[PDB]
From a paper:
PALS1 regulates cell polarity through binding to the PDZ-binding domain (PBM) of CRB3 with loss of PALS1 leading to disruption of cell polarity including loss of integrity of tight and adherens junctions. Importantly, the SARS-CoV-1 E protein’s PDZ-binding motif13 sequence allows interaction with the host cell polarity signalling protein PALS1 (Protein associated with Lin7/MPP5) thus interfering with epithelial function and integrity, a property of the SARS-CoV-1 E protein which is thought to be important for its virulence. As previously shown the PALS1 PDZ domains adopts a compact globular fold comprising five to six β‐strands and two α‐helices that form a β‐sandwich structure. Examination of both the PALS1 PDZ:SARS-CoV-1_E and PALS1 PDZ:SARS-CoV-2_E complexes showed that the E protein PBM peptides are bound in the canonical ligand-binding groove formed by the β2 strand and helix α2.
To understand the structural basis of the PALS1 PDZ and SARS-CoV-1/2 E PBM interaction, we determined the crystal structures of PALS1 PDZ bound to the SARS-CoV-1_E (SRVPDLLV) and SARS-CoV-2_E (EGVPDLLV) PBM peptides to resolutions of 1.74 and 1.9 Å, respectively. A comparison of our structures with apo-PALS1 PDZ reveals that similarly, both SARS-CoV-1_E and SARS-CoV-2_E binding to PALS1 PDZ trigger rotation of PALS1 Phe318 out of the ligand-binding groove to allow binding of SARS-CoV-1/2_E PBM. Our ITC measurements revealed that whilst PALS1 PDZ did not bind to MERS-CoV_E, it bound to SARS-CoV-1_E with an affinity of 29.6 μM, and SARS-CoV-2_E with an affinity of 22.8 μM.
Numbering used by the authors:
A (entry chain C): 205 to 211
B (entry chain A): 250 to 335
The structure:
Amino acid sequence: RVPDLLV
Amino acid sequence: GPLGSKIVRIEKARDIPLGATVRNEMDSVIISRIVKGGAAEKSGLLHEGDEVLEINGIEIRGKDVNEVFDLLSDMHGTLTFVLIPS
């Protein structure tokens, strides 16, 4: 599982 | 540039994201999506799969995405990205 963060 | 990289500049406003999500792949930071309607898309200079090596001289490779979120959340002005294209 891999976290996708918005920048 | 190093590792076959490229330099792109993009303007960032205070407290408004550029419109790009990032994920860690091994020790790297990768652009996972270009948000429709955001500055990153309109710029046409950031693309999904791009690896972020540097931002404003700060080494992004080797950083957890949460630390990258923190860095950009308070950045503004002309951002200089060092990128490896997909």
